[PDB]
Amino acid sequence: EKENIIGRIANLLAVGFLYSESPTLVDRFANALSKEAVTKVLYDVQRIVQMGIDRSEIATTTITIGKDYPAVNVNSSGAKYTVVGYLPTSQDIEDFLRMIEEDVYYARKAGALAMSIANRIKLGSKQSKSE
Amino acid sequence: EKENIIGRIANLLAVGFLYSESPTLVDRFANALSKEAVTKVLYDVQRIVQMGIDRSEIATTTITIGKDYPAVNVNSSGAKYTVVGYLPTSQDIEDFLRMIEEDVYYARKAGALAMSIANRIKLGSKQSKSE
Amino acid sequence: EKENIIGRIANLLAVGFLYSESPTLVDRFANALSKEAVTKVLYDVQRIVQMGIDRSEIATTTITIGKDYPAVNVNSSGAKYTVVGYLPTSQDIEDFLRMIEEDVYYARKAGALAMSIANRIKLGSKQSKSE
Amino acid sequence: EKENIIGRIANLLAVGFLYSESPTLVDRFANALSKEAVTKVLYDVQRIVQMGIDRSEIATTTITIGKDYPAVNVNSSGAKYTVVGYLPTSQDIEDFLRMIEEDVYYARKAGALAMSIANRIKLGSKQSKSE
Amino acid sequence: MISGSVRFLVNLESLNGVESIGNLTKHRTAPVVLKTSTGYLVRYVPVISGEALAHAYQASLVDIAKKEGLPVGSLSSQYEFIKFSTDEALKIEGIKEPKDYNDARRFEVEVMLKDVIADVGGFMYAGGAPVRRTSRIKLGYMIPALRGDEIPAQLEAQFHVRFSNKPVAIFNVEVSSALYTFSFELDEDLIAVPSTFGEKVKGEEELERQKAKRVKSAIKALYSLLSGNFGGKRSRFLPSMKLMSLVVTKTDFPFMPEPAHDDDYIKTTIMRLGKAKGVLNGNLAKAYVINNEGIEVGEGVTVLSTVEDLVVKLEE
Amino acid sequence: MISGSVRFLVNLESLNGVESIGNLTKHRTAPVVLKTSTGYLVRYVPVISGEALAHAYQASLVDIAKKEGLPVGSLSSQYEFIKFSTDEALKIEGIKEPKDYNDARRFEVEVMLKDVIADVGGFMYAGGAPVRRTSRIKLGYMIPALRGDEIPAQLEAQFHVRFSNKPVAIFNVEVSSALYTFSFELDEDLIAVPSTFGEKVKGEEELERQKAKRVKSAIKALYSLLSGNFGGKRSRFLPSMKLMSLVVTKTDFPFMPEPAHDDDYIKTTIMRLGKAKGVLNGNLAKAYVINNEGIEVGEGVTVLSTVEDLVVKLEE
Amino acid sequence: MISGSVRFLVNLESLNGVESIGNLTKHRTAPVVLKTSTGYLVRYVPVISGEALAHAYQASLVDIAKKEGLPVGSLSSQYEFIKFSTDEALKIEGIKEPKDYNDARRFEVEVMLKDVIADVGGFMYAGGAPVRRTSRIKLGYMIPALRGDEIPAQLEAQFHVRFSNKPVAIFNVEVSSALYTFSFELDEDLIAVPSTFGEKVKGEEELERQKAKRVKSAIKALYSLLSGNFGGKRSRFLPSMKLMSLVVTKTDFPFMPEPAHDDDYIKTTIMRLGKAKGVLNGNLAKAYVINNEGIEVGEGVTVLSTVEDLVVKLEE
DNA sequence: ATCTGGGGCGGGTTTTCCTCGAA
C-alpha cells in the first residue's frame, strides 16, 4: 500500500509536469530536506492540476493497453499526453505526509518515478512527430 | 528477462557516458556496494539523458545493421555516436532495483557491459577520423 | 570461436601487462580458482587499458606483416610495443565469463597465451636496443 | 633452420639450469606431453635468465675457441660457466612453439641437448677445481 | 602558535561549487555523523572548501606584502599560486634545479628569498631530489555546527531567466544558509626558518633580518579571513555576515581550541589552557574573546569589541 | 601497566591514504565482520592505520625528551625513525656492531643510552649477530564502532581545481566521516631495563638513575595521542575532533578493557577489574573514566573532567 | 577432564604468519571442505596455527609458577621451550642421560621435579633410551565458523611506507577479520603423575606434596587463552577481540563437545552430555555456558557472566 | 549553459635458523 501511495503521488507530479511543461516542482520535491518543502509542492502541483481540470485540459479516462486501465489525459500547448494510473486521494496525501514525517526518502522515490513517467511520455510523443 | 533488463540499463549508462564524455557515473555504478549508490546513478544518468533529449542531441532511431534494429543516436562535442538497443522502461528500472536489493552484483554486470559498449563505439569513431 | 575469444582475452591481458609493466594481473588470472578472481582481473586490466586510451598511449592500428593485420600500439616508459590482433568485445567478455563459469581452465589458457605474447615482444624490443 | 632454433632453445635451457643449479625446468621440458607444459617452462627459464641479466650474473660475450664465437657467461654460487652459442630470439620461441604444436618431440630433443651442454660444462668445472 | 576558532552567521549565499549537471550549479555538500538524543545518524549538509580560504588568505598576504619592501615572485605577483612545483615555473623565474641533497638547502634558501608566499605557505618540488616545505598555516572545511538534534542549515535551488527579444536563457543556481564555524592555526615560531637540515649557506643573514617584517605581515594577513572577505560569486550573490563569537590564543606549546559545537565552548578551552600550561612545561599562555551573543564566558578573559582590536593586540 | 580505550568523533576528514588511481587520492579502507539481527555480514569501511599514531607518539616523545635534557639520538634528532636498522645508521650514529652473541648485551646498552626513542619504542638490528627489542607501547588500527545494524561512517569524493591563466589541473580527493574508536597499552615496569640476557655491564647505573625521568617523559607523551594531534594532510584538511568517552586503567597484571563497540563497555570493564585482581592475586588496580555522552558508568570509580587531569593523575 | 568450545570475533588483525615473498607478508591460510545447499566445496581460509596458543599458555604458566614458588627450569626461565630434548639442554640443566630402560622412571621424576612446564606440557627426549610424556593440554587450529554457504571471513593487503629524508622502504602487510572458533581439552587427573611403568623411586613423595598447587596453577593458566592474549605482531596491530559464546564441561570420562560451527551447539552438547554419563557410568558431569549472541541454550544450566567467574568456579 | 583544464616524484624490504631418536 505504501508503494501504491508513492505511485499515485508520482502520477500527480508527472501530470503537473506535463501540463505546466516545467520540471521545477518535481526538482523541488526530489531535493526536499523538510516536510515543509514536500507539502508546498503537493499544494502547488494540485493547484496546477485544478486549473487544468477547470479548463478541461486534464481529464480522467480509461485506456485499453486488452483490459481497460485508469488514465489521465493531459492537453498542453497542442500536445496530448496520457498518464496511466490513478491520481492520489485525500487519504493518500495524508498517509504520504505521515511517511514524509518518518522519512523524506519517499519524496525522492516519488520524484524519481514522476520524472520516469514524464520522460517516457515525452520520448514517445517526439518519436511519433518525427515519423 | 533479467539479462534483457541488465542490457537495457547498460545501454542507458553507455548513452549517458558518451553524451557527458565522463566515466564518473559508470565508475560509481560498477563500484556500488549499496542500493543508495545504484539508485543515485540511475537518477543522475537519466537526468543527463533528459538534457540530451531536450536539446535534441539524444534521439531514438532505427538502423539497418538487413533488418532494422532499435538504436539511440548521441551527438556530443561534434562527435556522432550510435548505441544499438533500447533504453530501459520505468518497469526495467524498478525490476533492476529489486535485483539490486537481492544482489548488488547486477550493478557490476551492467557497468561492465556499459563500458564495453562505450569503448567499442569510441574506438570505431577514432579509427574513422584517422582514415 | 572459443579459441578466438581466448586469443582476444590474451591480447587484452598482454596489452595491459606491457602498458603497466606489471605481471600481477596476469599472475592473478592464471592462478584463478573462482569466477570472482577472473572477473576482477578483467575489470582491472580494462581499467588500465582505458587510462592508456585516454592518454593516447594505447591505440588500435593496422600493420602489414603483405595484408594488413589489426594491431594495438602500446607506448610505456618510452618503449613502443605492438600487439597483433583484436581486443575482446563486450560479447567476448560475456561469453568468456560463461566459459569460466563452466571451467576455470580457460583463464589459465588465456594467461599462458598472454605471457607468451608479452615475452616475445619484450625479447624483440631488448634485442633491437642491444643492436 | 629447425635445428638452429632447437639448438638456441637448448642453450637457453642450459643457461637457466647452470644459473639456477636446478634440473627441474629441463626435466619438465623433456617430459612435456602438451604445449602448456612447454610454454610454461619457456616462460619460467626466461624469468630465471632475466634475474641473472638484472644482477649482471648472466651476460652475452664472445670467446675465441681462432675465430670469435658468441657465448653466454653465467656466474652462479661463485662458479663461472660459459655456454657457447646464441640465446633464442622472440621469433625462435614463436617458431619453436609452432613446431611443438605439430610435434612435442622437439621439446625432448631440446631437453636432451640442454642436459648435454650443462653436463659437459659441470664436468669441466669440477675437473679444474680438482687439479 | 596562534590558534583559535570562530563562528559566523550567513544568509542567502553560494560561496563554492562543484561539477555542474545540466543548467543547475551544484553547491558543495558532504556527509556528517551527527549525535542526537537517540543515537548517531548520517546527514548530508552544505560545506565550503578549505582551499578557498587558503587562496583568499594568500591573496591578501600578497596584497599587503607588495605594499611594503617585502619581495614577491613573478608568477605569484599575479594571483596564480603554483609556486615552484613544475620546471616551467623554475625556468620562468630563473632558478637552477637542485643538483643533489647536499645542494638541497641552498635551493630552499634561494627559493625562500624571492617569494614570501613560498615561505609562509610552504611548497613542494618533485624531481630527482624532491624538496618539501610544510605550510605554516592550516585550515579545514567550514561546516555548520552540529549543535542539538537539528542542523541549522538549509539549501534550496533558484530560478533565473535571461531576457531575449528573439527566442529560438534559463538557469538555476543553488543557495544555502547556515550558522557556520571553523578553527584555524598559524605557527609564527618557524616563519623564515629553513626546514631542510644541512650546513648553513650564504644569504641566511638576510633571512634573519626580515623575520620580524615577515611575521608582522603574516599576522596582519589573518584579518582577511576574520573580516569575511573570501569565496567566489560575490559579484551578484553578496552574503550578509555578522560575527557572533571568536576565540584566539597564543602559546608556546602544541594546543588546539574546542570546535564551536556548543553554546559553552569558550569556558572549556580556557580551562584546558589553564590546566595544560603546567602539564607541558610552558612560559606563555594568553587568550582573547570577542563575544556578541551572550553565551557563557567565565572570568579572567580579555574582552574586545572589534576584530581590529584583536589584530592590533596580536601584532603588539 | 596502563591500558585504555577511547572513542573519538571525526567529521570531514582525510588523515591517511593508500595510493592513487588516475587523478584520485585513495583513502584507506578495510573489511570488517559485523553482527546484525539477520546474521553476519562483511562490510568495507574506512580505517586509519596504526603506524600513523606511533609516529605521532614518538615525535612528541622526541620533542619532550629534548626539552627536558634526556639524551636523543642523531638520526632521530631529525624525525627519521630508522633507529639502528642497518649498518649505515650505526655508522652515522657512531656505535660499533656486535661481535658475537656474548657481547650482544653490551651493544644494546650502548644503543639504549644514546637514543631514548630506541628504548621506549624498541628496535631491530639485522647482521651477523642480530639483536631485537620489542616495543613498550602497543597500538592498533582505528576502526569505527561496529554497533547496531548501521555502521555510522561515510566516505565520499570531492572535486578540486588549480587556477591558471594559460590553460593547456583537476584532482579528486577522498573525504570521510566516522565515529572512531581504539585502544592502547603501555607497560612502564620495563622502561629503562635491558631486555637481553647476560652478565652485568658498566653503564647500567646511569640507566637506573634515569629510570624515573624516562618513565615520567613516556607517560607525558601519551597526551599527544589523547589530545588528537596526529595524521597527515592536516594543512588544508584539518579535521574537527571531539572526545566522547574514555576509560583508562592502571594495574600490576595483564589486563585489557572492552573495546568501545558497545554502548555499555565502561561498566563491564570495571566489573571485571576486581574479579581479575582476585583471581590473579594483584596488589593494585585503579580505573579512571571520562564521560560526556551520558551512558552507564557504575560505582566506585573516579570521574574526571578533561584529559589533562588524567596525565597528572598518572604521573602522581 | 575439562573440555570446551569457544567462539571469537576478531577484526583487523594479523596474528600468525608464514614465509614472505617479495615485500609482502603472508597470513597463514588453509583449505577447508564445506557443505553447501548444492553439495560440497573446497575453499581457502585464514587460520591461526595451534602452537601459538600453546606458547601463550605455557608462558602464562611459567609466569604464575614462578610467582607462586613452584620449581621452574633454567632454559624455561627464559621463554625457550626446547625442554630436555637435546643433550645441550640436559648439560645446561645438569642431569645425566638415562642408561637403560630401568632408569626411565628416575629420569622422568628428576626432570619433572625441576620444571613445571615439562610436567603440564609434556616433553620428549630422544636417545639410547627414548622417553616420552604426552601433553596434558590439547589444542587445535582456530578456524572461522563453517556455517551455511557464506564463510564469514575476509583477507586483504595493506600498503605501508618508511619515510626518509634522503630517498634512495615500502612493504605490504596482510590483514584479516573473521569469526573464529576453537576447542580445547585438559585433564587434571594426570598432573604430577609419572607416566612410565616401573618401580617407585624416591622423591615421588614431594611430587605428591605439590600436586594441589600444580593443578591449581594449571587451571589458572587457561585464563590467558580465554581472555584473548596471544599471537604475534601485537605491537602495531593490536586486535579488537570479543567473546560471543562458550561452553565448558567437567567430567570423569572421555567427552568432546560439539564444534561451534552450527548455530545450536549448546543445546546439542548438553543433551549429549545428559546421556553420555549414563552410557559410560560416570559420577561427575557439569556444564558451564556463556551466551552473548542469544542462541538456543536449554533449561536448568549454569549461566555465568564472564571468564573470571568460570575460572573461579573451576578452581573451587 | 555556453570552456577549460583530467597530475606530477622519491622510494617496490633487510637476519636468524631448513629436524632431532627408537625401533
Swiss-Prot record, chains A, B, C, D:
Would the keyword Cytoplasm turn up in this protein's UniProt record?
no
Q: Does the keyword NAD apply?
A: no
Name used for this protein in its record = CRISPR type I-A cluster 2/Apern-associated protein Csa5-2
Subunit relationships: Probably oligomeric upon overexpression; does not interact with a Cas5 (Sso1441)/Cas7 (Sso1442)/crRNA complex. Forms dimer and tetramer-sized oligomers when overexpressed in the absence of CRISPR loci A-D; the oligomers are probably responsible for its toxicity in the absence of CRISPR loci A-D. Part of the aCascade ribonucleoprotein complex, minimally composed of Cas7 (formerly Csa2) and Cas5a, which binds crRNA. Other possible components of aCascade in strain P1 are Cas6b (SSO1437) and Csa5 (SSO1443), while SSO1399, Cas5b (SSO1400) and SSO1401 have sometimes been seen weakly associated.
GO molecular function terms listed in the Swiss-Prot or TrEMBL record: toxin activity
One BP annotation, GO: defense response to virus
Miscellaneous information on this protein: The aCascade complex was purified from strain P1.
Q: Which InterPro entries did the record assign?
A: CRISPR-assoc_Cas5
Q: Looking at the record's lineage, which domain of life comes first?
A: Archaea
- Keywords linked to the UniProt accession: Antiviral defense, Toxin
What is known about what this protein does?
CRISPR (clustered regularly interspaced short palindromic repeat) is an adaptive immune system that provides protection against mobile genetic elements (viruses, transposable elements and conjugative plasmids). CRISPR clusters contain spacers, sequences complementary to antecedent mobile elements, and target invading nucleic acids. CRISPR clusters are transcribed and processed into CRISPR RNA (crRNA). In strain P2 toxic when expressed in vivo in the absence of CRISPR loci A-D (strain P2 contains 6 CRISPR loci in all). It causes strong growth inhibition, a significant proportion of cells have degraded or no DNA by 20-24 post-induction.
Swiss-Prot record, chains E, F, G:
This protein's record includes keyword Cytoplasm: no
GO MF terms listed in the record are: RNA binding
Q: Which Pfam families would you find in this protein's record?
A: DevR
Query: Cross-referenced InterPro entries, in alphabetical order?
Result: Cas7/Cst2/DevR_sub_I-a/Apern, CRISPR-assoc_Cas7/Cst2/DevR, CRISPR-Cas7/Cst2/DevR
Could you tell me the superkingdom of the organism this chain comes from?
Answer: Archaea
UniProt keyword terms in alphabetical order: Antiviral defense, RNA-binding
ATP-binding is among the record's keywords: no
Q: From its record, what is one biological process in GO terms?
A: defense response to virus
* Disulfides per UniProt: none
Reported function? CRISPR (clustered regularly interspaced short palindromic repeat) is an adaptive immune system that provides protection against mobile genetic elements (viruses, transposable elements and conjugative plasmids). CRISPR clusters contain spacers, sequences complementary to antecedent mobile elements, and target invading nucleic acids. CRISPR clusters are transcribed and processed into CRISPR RNA (crRNA).
The record's section on PANTHER family has: CRISPR-ASSOCIATED PROTEIN CAS7_CST2_DEVR (PTHR37459:SF1), PTHR37459
The family this protein is said to belong to: Belongs to the CRISPR-associated protein Cas7/Cst2/DevR family. Subtype I-a/Apern subfamily.
| Remarks, miscellaneous | Crystallography and cloning were done with strain P2, while interaction experiments were done with genes cloned from strain P2 but over-expressed in P1. The aCascade complex was purified from strain P1.
- What is the annotated quaternary arrangement, including any partners? Part of the aCascade ribonucleoprotein complex, minimally composed of Csa2 and Cas5a, which binds crRNA. Other possible components of aCascade in strain P1 are Cas6b (SSO1437) and Csa5 (SSO1443), while SSO1399, Cas5b (SSO1400) and SSO1401 have sometimes been seen weakly associated. Csa2 is probably the major RNA-binding subunit. The Csa2-Cas5a-crRNA complex also binds target DNA homologous to crRNA, probably forming an R-loop. Purified aCascade forms a filament about 6 nm in width.
User: Under which name does UniProt file this protein?
Assistant: CRISPR-associated aCascade subunit Cas7/Csa2 2
Specify the species: Saccharolobus solfataricus (strain ATCC 35092 / DSM 1617 / JCM 11322 / P2) (Sulfolobus solfataricus)
